[PDB]
Write an enzyme that holds these catalytic residues in place. Structure first.
Site, PDB file in Angstrom:
ATOM      1  N   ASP A 185      -1.975   5.730   7.039  1.00 30.86           N
ATOM      2  CA  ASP A 185      -2.883   5.672   5.882  1.00 30.86           C
ATOM      3  C   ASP A 185      -4.343   6.010   6.211  1.00 30.86           C
ATOM      4  O   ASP A 185      -5.049   6.563   5.369  1.00 30.86           O
ATOM      5  CB  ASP A 185      -2.787   4.325   5.138  1.00 30.86           C
ATOM      6  CG  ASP A 185      -2.922   3.125   6.037  1.00 30.86           C
ATOM      7  OD1 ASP A 185      -2.957   2.008   5.495  1.00 30.86           O
ATOM      8  OD2 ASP A 185      -2.986   3.272   7.276  1.00 30.86           O
ATOM      9  N   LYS A 198       1.964  -6.543   9.449  1.00 32.15           N
ATOM     10  CA  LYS A 198       1.714  -6.974   8.069  1.00 32.15           C
ATOM     11  C   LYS A 198       2.912  -7.626   7.376  1.00 32.15           C
ATOM     12  O   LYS A 198       3.125  -7.405   6.191  1.00 32.15           O
ATOM     13  CB  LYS A 198       1.206  -5.807   7.209  1.00 32.15           C
ATOM     14  CG  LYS A 198      -0.220  -5.326   7.503  1.00 32.15           C
ATOM     15  CD  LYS A 198      -0.452  -3.974   6.783  1.00 32.15           C
ATOM     16  CE  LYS A 198       0.376  -2.864   7.412  1.00 32.15           C
ATOM     17  NZ  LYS A 198       0.024  -1.496   6.915  1.00 32.15           N
TER      18      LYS A 198
HETATM   19  N1  LIG Z   1      -9.951  -8.004  -5.514  1.00 31.19           N
HETATM   20  C1  LIG Z   1      -9.595  -8.121  -4.212  1.00 31.19           C
HETATM   21  N2  LIG Z   1     -10.542  -8.325  -3.264  1.00 31.19           N
HETATM   22  C2  LIG Z   1     -10.204  -8.446  -1.972  1.00 31.19           C
HETATM   23  N3  LIG Z   1      -8.921  -8.351  -1.584  1.00 31.19           N
HETATM   24  C3  LIG Z   1      -7.938  -8.143  -2.488  1.00 31.19           C
HETATM   25  C4  LIG Z   1      -8.258  -8.020  -3.830  1.00 31.19           C
HETATM   26  N4  LIG Z   1      -7.102  -7.808  -4.499  1.00 31.19           N
HETATM   27  C5  LIG Z   1      -6.097  -7.817  -3.591  1.00 31.19           C
HETATM   28  N5  LIG Z   1      -6.615  -8.022  -2.363  1.00 31.19           N
HETATM   29  C6  LIG Z   1      -5.919  -8.105  -1.045  1.00 31.19           C
HETATM   30  O1  LIG Z   1      -5.851  -6.812  -0.437  1.00 31.19           O
HETATM   31  C7  LIG Z   1      -4.536  -6.509   0.019  1.00 31.19           C
HETATM   32  C8  LIG Z   1      -4.001  -5.328  -0.784  1.00 31.19           C
HETATM   33  O2  LIG Z   1      -4.967  -4.278  -0.700  1.00 31.19           O
HETATM   34  P1  LIG Z   1      -4.615  -2.711  -0.837  1.00 31.19           P
HETATM   35  O3  LIG Z   1      -5.816  -1.947  -0.372  1.00 31.19           O
HETATM   36  O4  LIG Z   1      -4.031  -2.431  -2.204  1.00 31.19           O
HETATM   37  O5  LIG Z   1      -3.423  -2.582   0.228  1.00 31.19           O
HETATM   38  P2  LIG Z   1      -3.408  -1.569   1.465  1.00 31.19           P
HETATM   39  O6  LIG Z   1      -4.690  -0.761   1.517  1.00 31.19           O
HETATM   40  O7  LIG Z   1      -2.071  -0.851   1.350  1.00 31.19           O
HETATM   41  N6  LIG Z   1      -3.347  -2.503   2.832  1.00 31.19           N
HETATM   42  P3  LIG Z   1      -3.053  -1.805   4.241  1.00 31.19           P
HETATM   43  O8  LIG Z   1      -1.844  -0.933   4.003  1.00 31.19           O
HETATM   44  O9  LIG Z   1      -2.808  -2.958   5.183  1.00 31.19           O
HETATM   45  O10 LIG Z   1      -4.323  -1.034   4.516  1.00 31.19           O
HETATM   46  C9  LIG Z   1      -3.738  -7.794  -0.120  1.00 31.19           C
HETATM   47  O11 LIG Z   1      -3.720  -8.489   1.127  1.00 31.19           O
HETATM   48  C10 LIG Z   1      -4.488  -8.631  -1.126  1.00 31.19           C
HETATM   49  O12 LIG Z   1      -4.412 -10.016  -0.784  1.00 31.19           O
HETATM   50  O1  LIG Z   2      -2.593  -0.290   6.405  1.00 30.91           O
HETATM   51  C1  LIG Z   2      -3.680  -0.490   7.299  1.00 30.91           C
HETATM   52  C2  LIG Z   2      -3.230  -0.629   8.736  1.00 30.91           C
HETATM   53  O2  LIG Z   2      -2.503  -1.835   8.880  1.00 30.91           O
HETATM   54  C3  LIG Z   2      -2.152  -2.025  10.232  1.00 30.91           C
HETATM   55  O3  LIG Z   2      -1.661  -3.316  10.353  1.00 30.91           O
HETATM   56  C4  LIG Z   2      -1.074  -1.020  10.600  1.00 30.91           C
HETATM   57  O4  LIG Z   2      -0.497  -1.294  11.878  1.00 30.91           O
HETATM   58  C5  LIG Z   2      -1.765   0.345  10.560  1.00 30.91           C
HETATM   59  O5  LIG Z   2      -0.898   1.425  10.849  1.00 30.91           O
HETATM   60  C6  LIG Z   2      -2.449   0.591   9.231  1.00 30.91           C
HETATM   61  O6  LIG Z   2      -3.340   1.676   9.425  1.00 30.91           O
HETATM   62 MG   LIG Z   3      -2.718   1.931   2.792  1.00 32.08          MG
END
Ligand SMILES: Nc1ncnc2c1ncn2[C@@H]1O[C@H](COP(=O)(O)OP(=O)(O)NP(=O)(O)O)[C@@H](O)[C@H]1O
Ligand SMILES: OC[C@H]1O[C@@H](O)[C@H](O)[C@@H](O)[C@@H]1O
Ligand SMILES: [Mg+2]
Ligand SMILES: [K+]
EC number: 2.7.1.1
Length: 447
Positions: free
Chosen positions: A194, A158
Site C-alpha cells: 500500500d 495487523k
Molecule cells: N476518524 C478516525 N481517526 C483515526 N483513526 C481512525 C478513524 N477512523 C478509523 N480509524 C482507525 O484507522 C484504521 C483504519 O484506517 P484506514 O486508513 O481505512 O485503513 P488502512 O489504511 O488500510 N490501514 P493499513 O492497511 O494498516 O495502512 C483502524 O484501525 C481504525 O481504528
Molecule cells: O497497511 C500499512 C502497513 O501495515 C503494516 O503492518 C504491514 O506489514 C505493511 O505491509 C503495510 O504497509
Molecule cells: Mg492500505
C-alpha cells in the site's frame, strides 16, 4: 472543591508525563532506525535485520492504457475497483466496491481467505456486467519479491492469521482461488504494498514524490533507493522502491527504553506478540486500545469516573481509534467527549472529560513523534545518498490516522521538520492511492 479537581488533574499529568519523548529521544530513535535500514539493505545483515528493506521491483525508469482491476487487502475491508489509465499516465476510479472480511476468513485458512476474495471479485464483475482485465493487487503485508508479479508472504501483521499463506507465493494463492471458483479469469500482473501504491498514485501530479507512507491500521513507509545500495537485487543503475517494513522496528529490542506498561499489555493481547512493535506505538489498530488502557489505570488510581470502570470500558477494543480523533476534535464545551463516554456506559463529569482528552493527546502525540523519527530517518538517508545540500522531496501519505485525526498531521510535520534540516519536504494525501497506484504499476508490468 475545584482545589480537589485540580489535584486529580495534577496527578494525571504526572502519570501522563510518561508518554513524553524529548527531542534527543527522537534523534536516538531516528539514528537507530537509520542503522536498522542500513542493515536490511545489506546481504550480510539482511536476515537478522528487523527492518527488512524489501525490494519491490518498481523502478525509477519503468506503459499500457485501458481498463484495469485493482484489489486491495490490508485492513478490515477488501476493496475492488475498476480504474481507467490513460496518457505521463493519469488514473481515475470509475467503479468501486468494498467488502467486509468475515472473522473466520482472516483467522481461518488461506483457502477460506482467498475463496472469499474471489467471491468478492465475481460479485463485483457481476454488479458491472464485465465478467479479462489486467489485475493489480495492493497487498499490505511483508512480501519478499522475486519480481513485480511474484513474492512470498513473510508474515501476517495487523491481526491477520490465515494458515497456509506464510512462505507461499501470494499471487499463486490468489490465482489458485480464482481457478477453484472458475467463473471469471484475470491476468494478475502486479503485486504492491500500500505504501508503494500511494507513492505511485502521487507521481502524475508531483514527480518529486519518491516516498510513500501509510498511517492507518498499520504504519509503514517506502522510498526510492539507489540501486547500488540495494544489495539483494542485481544492477547499480538508477533507483528502486524499497518497502522498509519499519513496523517491525523494535522487534530486536531497539525501542525497549521507550516501551511503557500499556505497550506491553497491547503487545501481549495482540495476534502477533513480540512483533510489529514500532507499529504498535502508532497504528490505529492499537492507538484507541492504548488510550483505553491509560483510562483503566486512571480509574484504578481513583482519578477518573469515581474509580469505577464500566463493562464497556473493560471490554477489548471498545475505545475505538476514531474516538481518539473525536475527543481531540472537541471545541472546549466537552460535548463530543461526553457523548463518547456516555455510549460507553460511563457518567462523566466535566473533569473526567478533560482527563480523557489529555489521555488521547498523550497517546496520539507520542504516535506522531515516534512516526516522525522514522520518516526523518528515511529522508535524511536519501539526502546523504543523493548529491545535494538541500533535498526537496514529496511524501505521499494515506491512512485514517494521518488523514482524519485533527492534530496528528500537524504534530507529525513539525517534528519531522525539526529532524530534517536542509530538507524541504512536501506532504500530499493520496486520493484513492491504492486503486490508482496498483493500476499504474500494472500498466507498466503489462509488458
Ligand atoms: N476518524 C478516525 N481517526 C483515526 N483513526 C481512525 C478513524 N477512523 C478509523 N480509524 C482507525 O484507522 C484504521 C483504519 O484506517 P484506514 O486508513 O481505512 O485503513 P488502512 O489504511 O488500510 N490501514 P493499513 O492497511 O494498516 O495502512 C483502524 O484501525 C481504525 O481504528
Ligand atoms: O497497511 C500499512 C502497513 O501495515 C503494516 O503492518 C504491514 O506489514 C505493511 O505491509 C503495510 O504497509
Ligand atoms: Mg492500505
Ligand atoms: K544492486
Amino acid at each position: 472543591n475545584l482545589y480537589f479537581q485540580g489535584m486529580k488533574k495534577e496527578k494525571v499529568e504526572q502519570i501522563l508525563a510518561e508518554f513524553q519523548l524529548q527531542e534527543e529521544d527522537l534523534k536516538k530513535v531516528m539514528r537507530r532506525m537509520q542503522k536498522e535500514m542500513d542493515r536490511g539493505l545489506r546481504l550480510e545483515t539482511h536476515e537478522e535485520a528487523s527492518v527488512k528493506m524489501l525490494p519491490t521491483y518498481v523502478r525509477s525508469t519503468p506503459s499500457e492504457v485501458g481498463d484495469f482491476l485493482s484489489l486491495d487487502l490490508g485492513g478490515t475491508n477488501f476493496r475492488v475497483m475498476l480504474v481507467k489509465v490513460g496518457e505521463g499516465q493519469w488514473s481515475v476510479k470509475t467503479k468501486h466496491q468494498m467488502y467486509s472480511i468475515p472473522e473466520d476468513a482472516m483467522t481461518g485458512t488461506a483457502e477460506m481467505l482467498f475463496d472469499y476474495i474471489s467471491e468478492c471479485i465475481s460479485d463485483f464483475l457481476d454488479k458491472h456486467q464485465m465478467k479479462k482485465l489486467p489485475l493489480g493487487f495492493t497487498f499490505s503485508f511483508p512480501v519478499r519479491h522475486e519480481d513485480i508479479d511474484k513474492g512470498i508472504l513473510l508474515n501476517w501483521t495487523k491481526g491477520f492469521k490465515a494458515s497456509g499463506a506464510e512462505g507461499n507465493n501470494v499471487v499463486g494463492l490468489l490465482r489458485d482461488a480464482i481457478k477453484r471458483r472458475g467463473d471469471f479469469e484475470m491476468d494478475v500482473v502486479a503485486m504492491v504494498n500500500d505504501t508503494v501504491a500511494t507513492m505511485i498514485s502521487c507521481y502524475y501530479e508531483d514527480h518529486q514524490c519518491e516516498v510513500g507512507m501509510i498511517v492507518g491500521t498499520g504504519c509503514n513507509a517506502c522510498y526510492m533507493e539507489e540501486m547500488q545500495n540495494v544489495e539483494l537485487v542485481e544492477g547499480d543503475e538508477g533507483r528502486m522502491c524499497v518497502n522498509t517494513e519499519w513496523g517491525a522496528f523494535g522487534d530486536s529490542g531497539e525501542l525497549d527504553e521507550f516501551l511503557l506498561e500499556y505497550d506491553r499489555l497491547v503487545d501481549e493481547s495482540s495476534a502477533n506478540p513480540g512483533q510489529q512493535l514500532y507499529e504498535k506505538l502508532i497504528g490505529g489498530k492499537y492507538m484507541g486500545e492504548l488510550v483505553r488502557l491509560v483510562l483503566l489505570r486512571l480509574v484504578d488510581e481513583n482519578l477518573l469516573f469515581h474509580g469505577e470502570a464500566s463493562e464497556q470500558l473493560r471490554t477489548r477494543g471498545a475505545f475505538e481509534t476514531r474516538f481518539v480523533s473525536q475527543v481531540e476534535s472537541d471545541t472546549g464545551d466537552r460535548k463530543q467527549i461526553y457523548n463518547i463516554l456516555s455510549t460507553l456506559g460511563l457518567r462523566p463529569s466535566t473533569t473526567d472529560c478533560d482527563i480523557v482528552r489529555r489521555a488521547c493527546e498523550s497517546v496520539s502525540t507520542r504516535a506522531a513523534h515516534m512516526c516522525s523519527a522514522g520518516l526523518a530517518g528515511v529522508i535524511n538517508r536519501m539526502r546523504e545518498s543523493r548529491s545535494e545540500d538541500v533535498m526537496r522531496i514529496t511524501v505521499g501519505v494515506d491512512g485514517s490516522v494521518y488523514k482524519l485525526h485533527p492534530s496528528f498531521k500537524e504534530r507529525f510535520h513539525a517534528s519531522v521538520r525539526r529532524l530534517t534540516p536542509s530538507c524541504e519536504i512536501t506532504f500530499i494525501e493520496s486520493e484513492e492511492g491504492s486503486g490508482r497506484g496498483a493500476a499504474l504499476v500494472s500498466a507498466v508490468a503489462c509488458k
